[PDB]
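Supplementary material to the annual report.
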Amino acid sequence: RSSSYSGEYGSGGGKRFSHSGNQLDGPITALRVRVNTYYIVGLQVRYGKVWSDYVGGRNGDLEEIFLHPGESVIQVSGKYKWYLKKLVFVTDKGRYLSFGKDSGTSFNAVPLHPNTVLRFISGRSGSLIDAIGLHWDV
Ligand SMILES: C[C@@H](O[C@H]1O[C@H](CO)[C@@H](O)[C@H](O)[C@@H]1O)[C@H](N)C(=O)O
Ligand SMILES: [Cl-]
Ligand SMILES: [Cl-]
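Predicted assembly:
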């Protein structure tokens, strides 16, 4: 078994979402995070050349970061209360892609199995991001 799951980080509000089928389009190539004053509003992840369907609300500013070719996320940390507040994506190229506000319950996600990276994300959303889950695989 190479696959592993980190989470669920957050509360049980909003509605379930999963990017489980999105991993077929390719590896994670870019990240979109909408963030307001306190919370993380929305999430959107680019798998290969295809962007996922947007999950979350509209009340916030969009932040977009493209990843280098062959660069994959190897650690995910962040903070939350009832809703997700912070996200930091650590890549194998030694980059720390930080989004959101530095306040709340901390978490630090690492892959359980050898040589595995972040392949897709899941969680709960509504008008904000209620919870996030990290899925690791080869
Ligand atoms: C307060 C908020 O409610 C929506 O968004 C939250 C956070 O994403 C969810 O927990 C709720 O289930 C709901 O979808 C809106 N401002 C609202 O009043 O609808
Ligand atoms: Cl699960
Ligand atoms: Cl697209």
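Residues 50-51 surround chloride ion (ligand 3) (CB under 6 Å).
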